[PDB]
Amino acid sequence: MTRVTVQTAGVHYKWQMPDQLTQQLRLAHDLREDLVTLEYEYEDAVKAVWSSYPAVAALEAQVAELDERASELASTVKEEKSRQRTKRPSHPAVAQLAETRAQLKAAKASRREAIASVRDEATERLRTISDERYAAQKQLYRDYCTDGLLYWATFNAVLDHHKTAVKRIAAHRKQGRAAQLRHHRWDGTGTISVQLQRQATDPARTPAIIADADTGKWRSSLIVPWVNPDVWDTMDRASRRKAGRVVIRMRCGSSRNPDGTKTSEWIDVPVQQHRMLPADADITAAQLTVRREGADLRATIGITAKIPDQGEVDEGPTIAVHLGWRSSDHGTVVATWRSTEPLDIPETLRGVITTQSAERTVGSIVVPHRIEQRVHHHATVASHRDLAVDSIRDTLVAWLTEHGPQPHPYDGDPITAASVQRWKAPRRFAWLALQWRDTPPPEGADIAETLEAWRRADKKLWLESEHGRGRALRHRTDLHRQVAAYFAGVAGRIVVDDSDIAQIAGTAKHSELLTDVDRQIARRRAIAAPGMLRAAIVAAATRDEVPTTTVSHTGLSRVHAACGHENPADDRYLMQPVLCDGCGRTYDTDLSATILMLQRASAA
RNA sequence: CAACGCCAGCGCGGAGGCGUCAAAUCCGCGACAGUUGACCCAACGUCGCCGG
DNA sequence: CGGCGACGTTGGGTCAACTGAAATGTC
DNA sequence: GACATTTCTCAACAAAA
């Protein structure tokens, strides 16, 4: 009942998404954008109420002056970086910018302290602004739900997700980091929701109750076919394939009657099921998420449920997994592991999980070299796509300047040689090619033929690139989850450090390395995705109730476990092995990190 | 011709098809907790500065 | 040609909050 | 009255540009 899971079923690809589903997705999108605009108009009001007090106004003026000076100096140092191919300008502007940034930071802290001091005096005004936002959200509910064909479950899902997002943005900006809500362009993707409410004195929302299409207490919302997993797992793969092809009925939301009223509307999505929830689970909700890859729009419906815990374990080795992104002969070495007891690696994972020695107590995890090649092919083909888009932009501009401006078929802004010359995305060229293939403009036959030829070629290349790279990335994640499943299956405890890979990626610009080498390293880290491997290991260990421990990452790479000495940062950590200063031994950083990891785990 | 992508969730492997205004599904194995937003990075195209 | 940077578009990698039900007003 | 929908809200403090 603590442990939440999500059972995902994959909607049939031949399913033509009904107009109701797309209208609901668009309503959810528009609602999110309206909430974003409400947040912008709330931040403006709160900034104004802060600026009302004169002390904060003076501090903000000082901050603005320092901002202007710092912007000038930063432009200067960027110019110097361009002039001196060094990434470290060596100009007086560098020290000037450092001092100006420190003074600006102190000014911002002074303003923040003044705000904190004056907060209690402005408590009523802040409360009123918050009340205005909340009442605007209630009116948004009435606009979209009471009168607006958006199912209240989708509205509540979007509003709860947005409120969580604004809470996390406020928390991020409490720590002093850039964080602000952004808009997104409608893409045909999104999610709709159904909340199954269980009041007091109601039966548990078990899969058998939900599957009961005739008398189930939640027929009006959701109907998910269900086989008992005891029966389900026994049968063949083909039998499960055929028996999982079932329709799920969701409550999509209202539709507008010609008389001006609403009529409830359900969708019957034909989904392929592969796995069933436990008969003890409480089905909390359901979501139909529409995602896009290439030109293709796919859909998956996930039934969220709460499962009881099956009891912790205490029989197995302790395993320490230390993350990395070192290139190697066989592939990126994502992580190195070491165990207190020897491990028998399954033959299917022989390449992926490698052991250094016959003791088999220490080894590494290797992303295959083929995944890297299959991801690099995407860049190879995006080169062709963008060259082709540039060529068709040239042709369109040439034809337009020969034959003058052409009226838009139905677009508000007429297409002209200038606007086409300023078009960037291939979306616009595809849209024009579609609009013109049917109804070419005056003397537009040749240009429409070329436009459609380009759009055919580009769509083919787009599908191939996006699908190839997506399949390669999901193969990588499949390998990550195979490794995580193995470890959570054998391990009695799993040791992971709390090393924020997000910070590692962000601060890589200060690497004192050539930016090309920084970009090679960051591309490798992205392709191997160590943070995904660690998250998978932690998740698999949590599901199987295998205990996990987190050790501080401070000193893991520098400190030599045998030496006990923290080597300096310029000890050639990029290459291996690294020479310890304390004893002059060429120790390996990965093995030492794992050893200190196990030590710090046991000490805790 | 191949390669690449698609063909009842996802990945790997095999058979048979389709070439995007398309098609067609079938079989074995493994894993599977997902939605959101924020941030960062990368790729690609065009360009600028400096240097060989 | 390579080092440094701008612009724009497109998409992925990391980290984390969350996964509810009482009250109310209909048919 | 059994069922579907409305409702509830705790809060500031962001960076390069």
Author numbering: 1 to 604
Which statements did the authors publish about this structure?
Here we characterize a set of compact CRISPR-Cas12m (subtype V-M) effector proteins and show that they provide protection against bacteriophages and plasmids through the targeted DNA binding rather than DNA cleavage. Biochemical assays suggest that Cas12m effectors can act as roadblocks inhibiting DNA transcription and/or replication, thereby triggering interference against invaders. Sequence analysis of enriched RNAs derived from regions adjacent to the CRISPR array did not reveal complementarity to the repeat sequences, ruling out the presence of the trans-activating RNAs (tracrRNAs) and indicating that Cas12m proteins are guided to the DNA target by a single short (50–60 nt) crRNA. Here we show that DNA-binding activity without cleavage is a common feature of the Cas12m effectors, thereby expanding our understanding of the functionally diverse type V Cas12 protein family.
